């Protein structure tokens, strides 16, 4: 009942956290992502977050643990896309700039070039104004 597409969806999300590929999400990797997403997690609540799903008490989340907690709550996905846009559009102007998109991928530790970023916008920017609006952003996600 867990489709092959949902699992790969969860695997790709896990690999975003697991920047070093060691198969585990640490407090560092969790906090790094949360900051790139505009939040400022306290180092203690980072610990409390890992603690809720760490079943074997090693202070890390691995993929099956990650899978277990994502699979429990698959109840329905549009506001998800909307909120995601609100994260990327820092100046609330309704458009995601290249710099607004750079400052997230840079913060994520994606290790992408400024041209690589600019090609991501280019693929997404349909009307050609150099920026990604919400409806362009929807098609990019979906």
């Amino acid at each position: 009942q867990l489709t092959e597409e949902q699992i790969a969806e969860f695997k790709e999300a896990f690999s975003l956290f697991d920047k070093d590929g060691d198969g585990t999400i640490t407090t560092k990797e969790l906090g790094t992502v949360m900051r790139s997403l505009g939040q400022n997690p306290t180092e203690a609540e980072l610990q409390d977050m890992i603690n809720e799903v760490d079943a074997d008490g090693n202070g890390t989340i691995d993929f099956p643990e990650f899978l277990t907690m994502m699979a429990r709550k698959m109840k329905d996905s549009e506001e998800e896309i909307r909120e995601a846009f609100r994260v990327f559009d820092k100046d609330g102007n309704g458009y995601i700039s290249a710099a607004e998109l750079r400052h997230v991928m840079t913060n994520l530790g994606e290790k992408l070039t400024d041209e690589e970023v600019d090609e991501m916008i280019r693929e997404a920017d349909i009307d050609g104004d150099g920026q990604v609006n919400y409806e362009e952003f929807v098609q990019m996600m979906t």
């Binding site: 999300a13 609540e45 977050m49 799903v53 994502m70 990019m140």
Partner: peptide, 26 residues
């Protein structure tokens, strides 16, 4: 190319983690 859709589910994973803690704290 497969980065951006993963960001959507990454966000959901954080909401769930924060909910699990808040569930405990209450």
């Amino acid at each position: 190319d497969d980065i951006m859709p993963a960001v959507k589910t990454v966000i959901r994973s954080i909401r769930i983690l924060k909910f699990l803690v808040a569930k405990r704290k209450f």
